[PDB]
Amino acid sequence: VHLTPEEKSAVTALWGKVNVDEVGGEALGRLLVVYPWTQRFFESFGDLSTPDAVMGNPKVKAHGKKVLGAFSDGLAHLDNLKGTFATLSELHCDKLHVDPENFRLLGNVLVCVLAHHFGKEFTPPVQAAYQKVVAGVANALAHKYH
C-alpha cells in the first residue's frame, strides 16, 4: 500500500511462515463466532450454532482457505491491491451483496489470529505493518461498490 521497504519485508517474511490452510479456517470461523451477524451469508454451510460447530464446519474451513488464498496472492501486488481485487470487488458487490464492513472485521480477526499464532514474533512494529495491509485489502475490495 504505503508500506516502507522495511514494513514490506516484515509482512513478506512473516507470511512465508504461514500455513494458509489453518490460518484461513481459523480467521473465518472466529469471524462467525465473534460477530455472529456475519453468518447471514453462510446459511448453506450448515451448523454454526456453536463455536465448536463453526470451528469444526469443513465448509467454513474450506471457505477460509479460499479467502486467505486470494488474500495471500494479493500480498504479491502490494503496489496495486486495487487492480488486483477489481473483479473480486465487483463480485462481492454485484453478486454476493457483502457489505465492505465485513472486510474490515475479517482484517482485524486476521490480525488476532497472527498474534495468536506467532506470539513473540508478532511485534508492535510487525502488527503496525499488517494493519496497513488489512486496511489496504478491505479498501481494494470495497473499491468497485456502487
Binding site: 460477530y35 451477524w37 458487490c93 451483496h97 457489505d99 464492513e101
Partner: protein, 141 residues
C-alpha cells in the same frame, strides 16, 4: 440517556413531522442509498429506483417505528424489543449502518423543519437516533 429537555425537544420536532413521517422516512432512505451505496447490499430485493413503491412502503415502516419510539420515549427498549429481535436475528444489519441512516434522518428533518431544527433540537434528535440504534442493536451478540 435522554434528559427531560431532549424528550421535550424530540416530541416537539417529531410532533411537527406529523403526517409527513412516511415521506420523510422514504427520503431519508434515498439520501442514504445515494450517499452511502454500501447500504444497498441489504436491499438486493428492492427496486431502488426513484419513487420506488418498495422504498415508499419501506419509508413508512421506518417512520411508523420512530413515531412509536417517540410515543414510548420512557420505555423504548420494551416498545422496540420486537424490532430489536428482528434486526438481531433475521436481517443482521451491521451496526455501523445504523449511524448512516440516523445521519440521513437528521438531514431530511433539517431540510424540512428550518424553524424547529435549532442547535438544541439538533443535539436532542441526534441523541434520540443514537438511542434507537442502540436498542435495535442490543441483541446482536
Amino acid at each position: 440517556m435522554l434528559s427531560p429537555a431532549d424528550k421535550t425537544n424530540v416530541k416537539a420536532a417529531w410532533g411537527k413531522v406529523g403526517a409527513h413521517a412516511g415521506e420523510y422516512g422514504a427520503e431519508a432512505l434515498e439520501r442514504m442509498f445515494l450517499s452511502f451505496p454500501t447500504t444497498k447490499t441489504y436491499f438486493p430485493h428492492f427496486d431502488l429506483s426513484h419513487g420506488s413503491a418498495q422504498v415508499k412502503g419501506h419509508g413508512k415502516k421506518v417512520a411508523d417505528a420512530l413515531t412509536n419510539a417517540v410515543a414510548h420515549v420512557d420505555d423504548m427498549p420494551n416498545a422496540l424489543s420486537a424490532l430489536s429481535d428482528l434486526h438481531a436475528h433475521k436481517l443482521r444489519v451491521d451496526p455501523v449502518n445504523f449511524k448512516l441512516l440516523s445521519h440521513c434522518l437528521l438531514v431530511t428533518l433539517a431540510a424540512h423543519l428550518p424553524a424547529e431544527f435549532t442547535p438544541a433540537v439538533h443535539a436532542s434528535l441526534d441523541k434520540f437516533l443514537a438511542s434507537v440504534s442502540t436498542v435495535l442493536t442490543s441483541k446482536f451478540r
